[PDB]
Design a protein around this nucleic acid. Structure first.
Ligand code: MN
Ligand code: MN
Ligand code: MN
Ligand code: MN
Ligand code: MN
Ligand code: MN
Ligand code: MN
Ligand code: MN
Lengths: 132, 132, 132, 132
DNA sequence: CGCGATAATGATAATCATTATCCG
DNA sequence: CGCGATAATGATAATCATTATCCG
């Protein structure tokens, strides 16, 4: 077996060839690509693949914590393979590189801001725009 | 109060002020909250003629021209507000009021993160989502 | 104006950039391509294009006699720019070339076969499979 | 009549004849019409246990093995029949009975068209659609 | 004429026939 | 095990917010 299939086998999901390929595509990606970009990269590896399927997988994979959905501004949701720890993003406004970053002190403050306004933080989003 | 903060900005920016641009300028200057475009249409009919096509065109120009801030609060439609002289961020009740806040310290850290990466931050999006 | 836009202008349809491009794609095509193949060829000419739009156009263009829909066997419908006269197809089973062909005597026989079984022929389909 | 034309073909072709393959073989040998897969399922339940998954798998094998002819009559589902010793073609009531026919002369011409093109025809699809 | 009326666009979900997975 | 139960697939239509076209 492999990392993709094992997750699916353990998560009670049917391992299909396309789920496998989509999984692999996200696996060796540097950038955060939109759903089409995944569809293209998948169909390059294995043609037996629908856009409808690439949409159905991302939703599920997100629901199952196998991949994270971001939304950096443009209509398109960008997708990345869920990482070992949470990370936020710093977008270079010039040559649009993305920098993953982690800050423990912030998440705390953020949950403190929740418990101040009588809230429980079910999720957050932090993106920082920058220039050299 | 006879010419709104935003109508003043159009004037300064040399852009032509139509009765509808004026009306939507009213509505946006009025609002402490963050209406979607539909609410900006309703709020603008409670004053004058204004078409939907138009309300759309306008809140776009305004946004393009830095007069407005567009928010996506994970609920379909875009939501809008006048560009705040006093920067705030957003806690969203996932169930649906949007409490605005400022953490002088989250700001503090954000600046450091960008510094510690060799990037001066020129904007950021920080949103919190939760329940009580 | 041009051939595409004139048809649309005369057919009471809004000329959009994508309708224009899709039209052009079909215009300089040798083969009969599926909807994806059109989507790819379109996006090569002008990126501002949805698959959903490429689907919506083909239906309309067919409904408006601007392009013909065939179905040569595989799931995919193939599409060609509606020609000056009806033609049927001869598929080379070896190196899958398609040969357009016209036969007046057959259509007659076909309408005779209609009027024999008390029918009115609203449409037909003839494809011939061949080898050298 | 105890082993059907089609069960005989499996036997000859060395393929394994299961009770369900046998039953669907019955049903297909029985039918003068052209049932969709659902009707082939109903007709096969009116004899034995047979699952839908299975009816699908079978009429596919049969079709793959040249025992069956698949038709698409422009109405969603595929429709099926035993491979006729006597070739016919199809007039479809667009409103929904399918009268079978033979034009010894359309056959005549088809052969010529392919000849006049330098191709021996090894199969053809000719369907007529109409109302009274 | 920048606007209104309105239909087209685009991202993505839905539908439904057919297909593959999994399991016993 | 080729099968049943069932969910996944693929082509394509539907939805709905936003956008462009056209016209006066
Ligand atoms: Mn964070
Ligand atoms: Mn990331
Ligand atoms: Mn902030
Ligand atoms: Mn605000
Ligand atoms: Mn013909
Ligand atoms: Mn043709
Ligand atoms: Mn024939
Ligand atoms: Mn028949």
């Amino acid at each position: 077996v492999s990392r993709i299939e094992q997750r699916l086998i353990d998560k009670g999901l049917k391992v299909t060839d396309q789920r496998r390929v989509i999984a692999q595509v996200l696996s060796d990606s540097a950038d955060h690509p939109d759903v089409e970009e995944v569809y293209r990269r998948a169909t390059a590896k294995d043609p037996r693949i629908s856009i409808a399927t690439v949409y159905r997988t991302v939703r599920l994979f997100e629901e199952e914590s196998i991949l994270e959905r971001h939304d950096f501004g443009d209509g398109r949701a960008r997708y990345e393979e869920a990482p070992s720890e949470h990370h936020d993003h710093l977008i270079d406004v010039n040559s649009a590189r993305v920098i993953e970053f982690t800050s423990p002190e912030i998440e705390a403050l953020q949950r403190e801001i929740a418990r101040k306004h009588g809230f429980r933080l079910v999720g957050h989003r932090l993106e920082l725009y920058g220039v050299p």
